[PDB]
Amino acid sequence: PRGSMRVLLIEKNSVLGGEIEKGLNVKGFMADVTESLEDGEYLMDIRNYDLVMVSDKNALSFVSRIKEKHSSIVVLVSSDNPTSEEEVHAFEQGADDYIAKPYRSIKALVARIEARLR
Amino acid sequence: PRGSMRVLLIEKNSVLGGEIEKGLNVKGFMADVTESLEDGEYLMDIRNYDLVMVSDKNALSFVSRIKEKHSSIVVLVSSDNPTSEEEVHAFEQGADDYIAKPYRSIKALVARIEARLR
Incomplete structure (x- = not known):
């Protein structure tokens, strides 16, 4: 089902983030790109994502915070x-x-x- | 629980296969190494594995055969x-x-x- 899955992409490189969003769209996925990990963490509280991919220096503490708060989200x-x-x-x-x-x-x-x- | 999970390693390089088996043993896993994909496929029918890792030229057809026959095994x-x-x-x-x-x-x-x- 088209748009039934939403993906959050935390990615500083806007060109690359765009390319991944477009690729995901090919398979019927919705995707939001953000360059900010603090923004991404907040977004997860106000929107329902099925998966987050994070590239950031402080990714590891974030992984644990999300796994505790949002356990069913794939990280x-x-x-x-x-x-x-x-x-x-x-x-x-x-x-x-x-x-x-x-x-x-x-x-x-x-x-x-x-x-x-x- | 020690030895509760068994892993099959299909790997032509016996030195590398040994190193992976020893590494898995560290975490309490049992592991069998075979250099033969036909041997490995047969082993799956007579022993119960939780996971198989395969490096072989014909790996892809094997993936589909195992996914159909042994659906809960991780590949x-x-x-x-x-x-x-x-x-x-x-x-x-x-x-x-x-x-x-x-x-x-x-x-x-x-x-x-x-x-x-x-």
């Missing part, structure tokens, strides 16, 4: 400086995925998001 | 030649994850497997 952490240490932490904090940036492709990223909502 | 596809096209296909075929080789680390791979069984 994907994406990082331009991926490390083994941060991957382990993200999963231990309850993230549903950890994705290195840059992405393989918009289509591959969308397929993964699709799967995470399956 | 992770790992590839030494990752492409956008094959990632999309793996997810569309019902894989729970698609992981590029080489791995970030054994600990990061184990954390991901842990999460996929959560």
